[PDB]
Amino acid sequence: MSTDRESQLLRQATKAGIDSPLELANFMAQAGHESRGLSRLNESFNFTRGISQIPVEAAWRNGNAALESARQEALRGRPENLAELMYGGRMGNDAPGDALKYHGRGYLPLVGKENYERAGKALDLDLVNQPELAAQPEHAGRIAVWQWQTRVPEGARHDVREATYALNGALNGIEARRQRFEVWQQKLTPDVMARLDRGEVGAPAQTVARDMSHAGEPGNALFEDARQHLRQMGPQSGLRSAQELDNTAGALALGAQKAGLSRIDHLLAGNDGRTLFAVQGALGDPAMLRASVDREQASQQSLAQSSQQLAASVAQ
């Protein structure tokens, strides 16, 4: 599914010389955001909230009402009028129908007749006459790498904010791009990069990682604080298995890390036995920090999931 198209794009990118894990994560974050994880290879002309969502200033040149009428027509499957407002008379879209014919396609959307002309010439693809080729995953990958290597200067290859600006001349969805960037930085380990260099099909293997219950792993300090305090509660902790105690410690360390605690000094039961509160500092300290977990959900919450979420949280 997404894994197959993501693996294909990772191989195409590394085959084109995008070898830096930092540059590759950035490239993958921009492509993932602009195509919703490589699942949307065609531009959507559907705007359900309002015309304020339409990101092209030029679309208002015929007044607010003509733009609202084109929006309703696009929602009914006739986006020609909206495409003409958004891209007509720009980027080589001279003839009627060009704006929609050359709508965005690909991972780093190719839009406008002149960009289909330039990309076609550079990649030996008949994109002007068969623009649909730009929405085919294989060609889409080659076109995204070309957009990246020709529109992003070397100095902006490692920064999500600068790369987004060099690509789009504006900063849209920076939060979502930053989140995708941090996920790719975690996935592109040395062995994953080595398997991409070797050209392996399933190179992006995640593999079993050590959980926070192992010494030296991210969250281990908070995990041991939680585990010690759970064992101190004795039979009153309501935990009937070592596995449930470990799961609860993992959930507690995660909540603690998310709320800014560096240490769990105390564990308190509350909400009629349904909640566990992790506390940093004495209970009478007005600077005391706190975090809470649902006891039932925490006893069955995977320690591998808790360890993954805490590691990402610390990396953020």
Residue numbers in the entry: 1 to 316
Manuscript text:
As a result, we determined the structure of TfcB to 1.9 Å. There are two molecules of TfcB in the asymmetric unit. The N-terminal domain is composed of two helical bundles. Helical bundle A (η1–η2, α3–α6) forms an apical head-like region that is linked to bundle B (α1, α2, α8, and α9) by long helix α7 and loop 2 (L2 connects α2 and η1). These helical bundles connect to create a cleft or concave groove that consists primarily of residues from L2 and loop 3 (L3) that connects α5 and α6 and protrudes down into this groove. The C-terminal domain is composed of a single helical bundle (α10, α11, and α12) adjacent to a three-stranded, anti-parallel β-sheet.
Thus, TfcB is comprised of a fold similar to that of characterized GH-19 chitinases/endolysin. Furthermore, the SPN1S protein’s apical head-like domain is important for interactions with peptidoglycan. These analyses demonstrate that TfcB shares significant structural homology with GH-19 enzymes and may target a component of bacterial cell walls.
